[PDB]
Design a protein around this ligand. Sequence first.
Ligand code: ATP
Ligand code: ADP
Ligand code: MG
Ligand code: MG
Lengths: 187, 48, 57, 470, 495, 95
Amino acid sequence: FAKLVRPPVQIYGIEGRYATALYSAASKQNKLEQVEKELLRVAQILKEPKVAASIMNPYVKRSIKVKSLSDMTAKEKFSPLTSNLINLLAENGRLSSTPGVISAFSTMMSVHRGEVPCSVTTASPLDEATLTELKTVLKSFLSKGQILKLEVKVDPSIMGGMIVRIGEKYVDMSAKTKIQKLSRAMR
Amino acid sequence: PEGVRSGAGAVRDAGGAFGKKEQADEERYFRARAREQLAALKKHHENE
Amino acid sequence: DYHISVQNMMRQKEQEHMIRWVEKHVVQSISAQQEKETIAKCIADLKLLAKKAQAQP
Amino acid sequence: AATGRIVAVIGAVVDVQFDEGLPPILNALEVQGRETRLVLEVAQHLGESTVRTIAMDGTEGLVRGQKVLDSGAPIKIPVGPETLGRIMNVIGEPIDERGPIKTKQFAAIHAEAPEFMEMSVEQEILVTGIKVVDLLAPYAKGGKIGLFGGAGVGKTVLIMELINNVAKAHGGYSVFAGVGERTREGNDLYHEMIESGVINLKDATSKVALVYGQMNEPPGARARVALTGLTVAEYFRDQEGQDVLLFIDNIFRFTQAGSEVSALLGRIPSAVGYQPTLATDMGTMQERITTTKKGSITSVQAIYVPADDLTDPAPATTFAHLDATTVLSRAIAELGIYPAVDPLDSTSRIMDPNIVGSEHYDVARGVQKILQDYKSLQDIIAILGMDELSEEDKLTVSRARKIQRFLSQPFQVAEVFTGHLGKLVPLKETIKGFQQILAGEYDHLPEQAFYMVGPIEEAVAKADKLAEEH
Amino acid sequence: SSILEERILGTSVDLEETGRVLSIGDGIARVHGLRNVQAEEMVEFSSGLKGMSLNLEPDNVGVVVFGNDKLIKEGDIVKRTGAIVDVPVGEELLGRVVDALGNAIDGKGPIGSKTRRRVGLKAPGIIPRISVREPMQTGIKAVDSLVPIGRGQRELIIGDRQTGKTSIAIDTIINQKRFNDGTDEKKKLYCIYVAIGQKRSTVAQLVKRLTDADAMKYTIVVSATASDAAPLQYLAPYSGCSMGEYFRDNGKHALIIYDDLSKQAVAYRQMSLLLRRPPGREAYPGDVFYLHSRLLERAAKMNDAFGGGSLTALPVIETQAGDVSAYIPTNVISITDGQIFLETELFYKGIRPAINVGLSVSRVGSAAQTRAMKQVAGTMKLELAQYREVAAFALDAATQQLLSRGVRLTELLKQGQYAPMAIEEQVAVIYAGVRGYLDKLEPSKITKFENAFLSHVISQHQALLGKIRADGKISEETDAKLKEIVTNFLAGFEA
Amino acid sequence: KTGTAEVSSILEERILGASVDLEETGRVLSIGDGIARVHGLRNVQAEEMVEFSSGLKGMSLNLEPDNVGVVVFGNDKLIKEGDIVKRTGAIVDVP
Ligand SMILES: Nc1ncnc2c1ncn2[C@@H]1O[C@H](COP(=O)(O)OP(=O)(O)OP(=O)(O)O)[C@@H](O)[C@H]1O
Ligand SMILES: Nc1ncnc2c1ncn2[C@@H]1O[C@H](COP(=O)(O)OP(=O)(O)O)[C@@H](O)[C@H]1O
Ligand SMILES: [Mg+2]
Ligand SMILES: [Mg+2]
C-alpha cells in the first residue's frame, strides 16, 4: 500500500477515516480549496427535504439510491473525486454521517493554516478599547501562527477577574482566591 | 463405570476419625514389641 | 485537667466563629460597584501580568 | 533503519506506528530518551502501519509521541567461554558489578529445533547416590528429568543436592537458570559456589554460568529468561564437542507469565483461565533441549503443582516431554520421612530386564508389590483391632514398615535442619540391603534402627548402641 | 487573633496544560485534551480533588479519582502537576495517624517533613544482600520456641474469621517497649500498622489500646477505611512500604504489618472492571499475582556496605470455611517464607492462642535464635511429636507416661492477652516443665502454679535472670541453682 | 460496526480512480498467531490451499463478505502486511 500524507489534527472515528482518506487524496493533485468549496456546495444541496426523504428511508433499494445520487452529482456542475466519495459512501451505506465527514474536513483544513482558537471570560462586559488592547497583547503571545479566534463570554457567576485560554494553555485569575483564603482555616 | 468407584487405602486418605483411630493402634502395638526385642538383644550379647 | 480542657474548648469555638464571620463579611462586602472599579484596576494589573508572562517565551 | 512513535500505553502492552518501514515479527526495538535501557518486542501486525509490542521492564514515564528506533534483528546476547563465573540479565547485561563481558560472538535467542534425522538412540545409567532414585527410577545420561511437587515439600533442597553430587565430579561445564523465584535464594547460591571453589574471582578456571530473572519483574521478562538460558548451553553443545549440564528452577513460571497478557492481546480464554496457545508454546521451547549427534545435554527441571492437583492443565501436558519423573508428596512428609518421594508414582524408561539386569529388576518389583499389599490391610485394622489379624498378616505388616523406613536418608546440604552428617550409598549395597530385608534376615530388630542411615551395616551398629543405652 | 492575620499575611499564577472532561460516572473520568502526559502521573481537578492516569489511548485518557465524584461534571478543566505520585517520608511521622496520601486526620496539626519518595520502586537485587542472622522477639511462648522469626523475613498469618489474628500483631507491637527504652541503638525496632477495609471504630479502639500502654511514641498508623474510594485502598500498602524503606537505608530496623490483604484485591478488581478490561478467574484481573509479588519482595537484609538496615513483613489472609486451596491464598502461600495456622476447633477446646504446631513452619532453621532457648526447645519438639502420633484413640511403661507428659506440656503453652513475656522468664518456665518437676500435680492446677512461681521468681531472684540474659546460655552453676529453687518452691507452694 | 476492510488505504485507492486482479490474487491486511486476514480472492472455494509470497502454504476456512481468514502452515515470522496471495485451484491430496 502506498504511503499517504498525514493531516495535522488527526481526528478519529469512521468520519475520521473517510476525512483522512479524502485529505490524502486532495493533497495529491493539489485540490484542497476546490474540494472544500465543492463539499460546501454538496452540504448546500443535500438539505432538500425531498432528497432527505429519499436518503432517510431504509425500505428503498440501495441500487436506486446510488443512481439518484450519481445523476445529481453528474448534472449539478463539478466532477472531481468528490463524485467517487459520494458513490463510495452510498455503496457502503454511510450516508447518515456525511455532515460529520464534511465538518471533520472543515476543521482539518482550518488547522492547515491554524488560527489557534482562544477564549476570554469575564464577569462584566469589558470596553471595546480594552478589547483591542487585549487583542494587541494576545497577538504578542501568539507569535508564530495565524489570526487568533476570540470568543468573548460574560459569566457573572464569578465575583470578578479574567480567565484566558490559548490552545492548551490556561491561566486563571478570578475570585477563585477565596478558596486560597479559606485554606487558612486548615493551616 | 459411570458411578463413583473406590479403591485401596481410601479410609486413611480422607483423614476422618477412623484414620487417626487406625494410626494410633498400630503405633501402640509396635511400640510394645521393641522393648522385648531390645531386652533379648542385650541378654543374647551379654551371654556370648 | 478539667478546667484546662474547658478553657481550650472555648478558645477553639471562638476561633471557628471568627473565621466564619470574616469570610461571610468578605463575600457580603464585595459589591457590584466595588467589582466594577476593582475589575478596571485588575484589567490594568492582569494586562500587565499577561505582558510579564508573555515576556517569558 | 526505521523510526516510529508511541500511540498507546495500556498496562504492559504498547503500540507503535511506523511511517517508513515495517519491522518483521520477533524483532527488538529501543525507546529513545530514557536514562536506562528499555526494549520492546513485536508480537502482531494490526494493519494501517501499526504493531503491538510487549515491554521488558517498567513502563511508567512513557509519553505518547515518543520516538522509537528499530534494531533490525531479534534479541542478541554475548556467548562464549568468557561468560563463566558471571551473572547476566534477560537481555545480556552484567549484574555483578565487575565490568563488561568481552567476547567475540553473539547469538539470537529465537532458533528452530533439530530435525528427525539428527536424533540419537543411547541409554546408560547415571548413578547419583540416593537409594530411592537408584532403585525404583534410575536416571540416564543425556536424558530429561522432572521433579514434580507442591509447595514446601523439598524441590530446591533436592536440586541443590543433585548439583553437589553430580556437578563437581563432571568434566564439562554447567549452566543454571532461575525463572520466577526468590532473590534471597539467588544470593545464597552465589556465595555457596564461591566457598566450594567452583566459581573463582582471581583465576580463569570457573565451571558455571548463571542467568537470573525473578518474581519482582514484569510478566514480559519472566517469559523469556529460559530461552536466554538455553541459548548459552546450545553454544557449548554445538561449537564445542563437550557434554553440558542444565538446571532450571520452576519452569512453571514460564507458562503462568504468558497468561497475564493474553487478554490484553485480544484473545478468548480457554479452560481454567489459560491462553488457547498453551501446548504449542510449551512444545516449541521443549524441543530444543535434546542430545543431537554433535553433543550431549543432560537437563534437570523443577515443576510446581498448584494445590497438589496433578490434573491441572499446566503439569498435565508436561509428562509427555520427559524420560524420568519423581513425584514428591505431602502425606509422606508428615510422617517425617525425607526425601518425600512417592514410591508408587515414579517411573523411568530404562527400567527393563535387558538394561539393568534381572536381580535389580526383581528386587524393585518385589518391593513395590509388598508396598501395594500394605494398603489393603489398613482397611481391616480400622474396624477390627490390630490383634485380631492372623500371624502372616502381622509378619507382612512388620516387614512393610521396616522397608518404608529404610528409604529415608540424611543429606549433606541439610545438616542445619537434621543435625547429622550426610551419606552416600553405592548401587550394590542398595540392592543387597533390600534383598536381605525381603529375605527375612532381620526380623529380630526394632524399627527405629532403620531410620536415617546409610548402608545396611549401620542399622545393626545403631541397634547395639540402643541396646547398650537401655 | 493576630495568628490568623499572619496566616493570611503569607500569590503567583502561571500557564499550565489542560484537558477537558468528556464523561464521568462511578469514579472514572474520560478526558479529552492533555498531550504530553506521562503514564502514572498525578493530575488535579478544578474543585481540589486529585487523580492518576492509567490508560493512555489515541483519543482519550482514563483517570481514576482519589475521593468523591459528585462534584465533577462534563466540561470541566484538568491540570497536570508534572510529578509521579509520591508520599512524604521521614521520622516526623512517629506518633501520628495519617491517611493513604500522608494527611493528618488526628487533629494535631501539619506535619513538618523535608523529603518525598515514590511509591513504586524496585526491590534490591542480589549483590546488596546478606544472610539473616538476628532474632525478632514477640513474647508469645508458642512462637518464640517452635516457630522463630528472624530480621529480614516474611511470615504469613492465615485463618478464618474470629480466630485471633489481630491480637498476635498487637501483642508483638507492645513487646518492643523494653528495647526502645534502652541505650544501644542496635536493638531498637520501629513499627508500622496499615488498616485496609476496616471500619473506623475498630481503629479508634486499637489506637486507644495502644496509647494506654505507652506505645504510640514509636508507631505509625496508616488507614483507608471502608468508606474511602477504591483507589485509596488499592494504594495504601505501597504508601506504607515506602515509609518503611526510609529506615532500611539509614542503618535502622523496622517492622510493617498489612492487615487483610484479601481486601486490597477486591478494590483492585472493582477498579479494573470499570476501566473495561477483560476479567479472568472469578473476574479477578489477569495479574493479581504480580500485585503482591512486587510488594513482598521489598523486605530484605542489607550488608555492611549499605548500612546494615532491615525490614520485616507480616501479611494477613482470611479463608472461607477453612479452605486453604482457594485462588488467592495459594498465590500468597508460595511467596512467603512460612506460615502460622489458626483453627476454630482448637479455639473452642480451650487452646488459646489456637496455633496448630503440626503444620506451622519457619524456613530459617533456627539460625537466629538464642543459645539458651535451643537447649530446652529442641527437647520439647520430640515430646510433642511423639505425643501426637499415639495419644488420640477415638502400656504403663511407655504409653501412660507419654500422654502424662504430653498433657502437662500442652497446658504450659496457653497464655493470656496483652501481656508478653521476656525471654529468660520463658526459659525458666519451660525449664521447669521439661525436666519433669510437674509430673505429679493434677493438670487442672498448672496455670496457678505458673503465675505464682513467675511472680515469686521475679521478686526474690532478680540477680539470677541477669546471668542468663548477659551470658546468653545456661551454665553448670545456673543449672545447680535452678533445681534447688524449683524443688523448694514446689514443696512450699502446695496450697 | 466498522468493517475489517473499512480502512483508509483501501478507500483511498477507490477515491483515486483506478490494474490489480482481485479475482485470483489478494493482499494481506493483518497477521498474528497463525491467522491471516486477506483482501480479494473472489473466486476461492471453501477448504482450498493457497500459496504465500515467501513459499509457505495456507488453507481457507472462513469466507466472510469482505475478507477470508487463512491458517498458516508454518512460522508467522515470514509473513508481513502487504504481501501477495494467489490461488492453486485444488484441495489437499496425498500420495
Ligand atoms: N489468647 C486469647 N485469650 C482469650 N481471648 C482471645 C485470645 N486471643 C484472641 N481472643 C479473643 O478472640 C476474639 C477474636 O480476636 P481477634 O479480634 O484477634 O480476631 P480476628 O481474627 O482479627 O477477627 P476478624 O476477622 O473479626 O477481624 C476476641 O474476642 C479476642 O478477645
Ligand atoms: N532432609 C530434608 N530434605 C528436604 N527438605 C527438608 C529436609 N529436612 C527438612 N526439610 C524442610 O523441607 C522444606 C522444603 O523447603 P523448599 O525446598 O524451599 O520447598 P520447595 O520444595 O517448595 O522449594 C524446608 O523448609 C525444610 O525445612
Ligand atoms: Mg523452591
Ligand atoms: Mg482482625
